[PDB]
């Protein structure tokens, strides 16, 4: 690893600098180096890891969607043949995206998940595993698409089970997990009713737990609840 010679603390410090500079590829390489030191990650360090890769893969996914829409338009009735370039470049972006997903999944599997015993870390990493299998599923088209989908489902479900037993309904990780598993149901698993049921039940159960919270915790929870509401308004 190109980060093997740098101190763990320096990698974390530089990941925070990269965040401030919106250099998310750098931020992700720094946090990968930090994970590969072999020590567990703190709460703040897990957030740095997730934010870095979320932004890297988020830009790749947006580019892939632009290119895939061009590709699909080029295969409509009446489109002039333009050669293999659109497909080639879509494939190039797709392959780079899959490489990032594989790298994150490899960090989770070696060895973040197996050492995560507290609910907040275990649920967090299983949500990530679900998320990156979901991004693979968004571009999948071959023999293993169903297994990719089921891997996303399985990881989200284990995280859901732990979060329901071990975290209050307003916990931001629990809420963000439910938000994304709902999106998975809606547009990956062809289960819009499940997506709507999960978003509503999650929102209503958080609502009823807000009275237990401090002002700051209230703000943290309501922010993600509003994203659940946004999706319900879009989907109904």
């Amino acid at each position: 690893g190109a980060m093997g010679s740098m101190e763990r603390a320096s990698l974390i410090q530089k990941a925070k600098l990269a965040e401030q500079a919106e250099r998310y590829e750098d931020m992700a390489a720094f946090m990968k180096g930090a994970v590969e030191k072999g020590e567990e990650l703190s709460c703040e360090e897990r957030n740095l890891l997730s934010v870095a890769y979320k932004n890297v893969v988020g830009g790749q996914r947006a580019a892939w969607r632009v290119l895939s829409s061009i590709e699909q338009k080029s295969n409509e009735e009446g489109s002039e043949e333009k050669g293999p370039e659109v497909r080639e470049y879509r494939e190039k972006v797709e392959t780079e995206l899959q490489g990032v997903c594989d790298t994150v999944l490899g960090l989770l599997d070696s060895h973040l998940i197996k050492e995560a015993g507290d609910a907040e870390s275990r649920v967090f990493y299983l949500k990530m595993k679900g998320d990156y299998y979901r991004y693979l599923a968004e571009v999948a088209t071959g023999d293993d698409k169903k297994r990719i989908i089921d891997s996303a489902r399985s990881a989200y479900q284990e995280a859901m089970d732990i979060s329901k037993k071990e975290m209050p309904p307003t916990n931001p990780i629990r809420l963000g997990l439910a938000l994304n598993f709902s999106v998975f149901h809606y547009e990956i698993a062809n289960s819009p009713e499940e997506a709507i049921s999960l978003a509503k039940t999650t929102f209503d159960e958080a609502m009823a737990d807000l009275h237990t919270l401090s002002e700051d915790s209230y703000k943290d929870s309501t922010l993600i609840m509003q994203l659940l509401r946004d999706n319900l308004t879009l989907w109904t």
Binding site: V183, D230, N231
Partner: peptide
Amino acid sequence: QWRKSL
């Protein structure tokens, strides 16, 4: 709107 994920 693009649906929300986190």
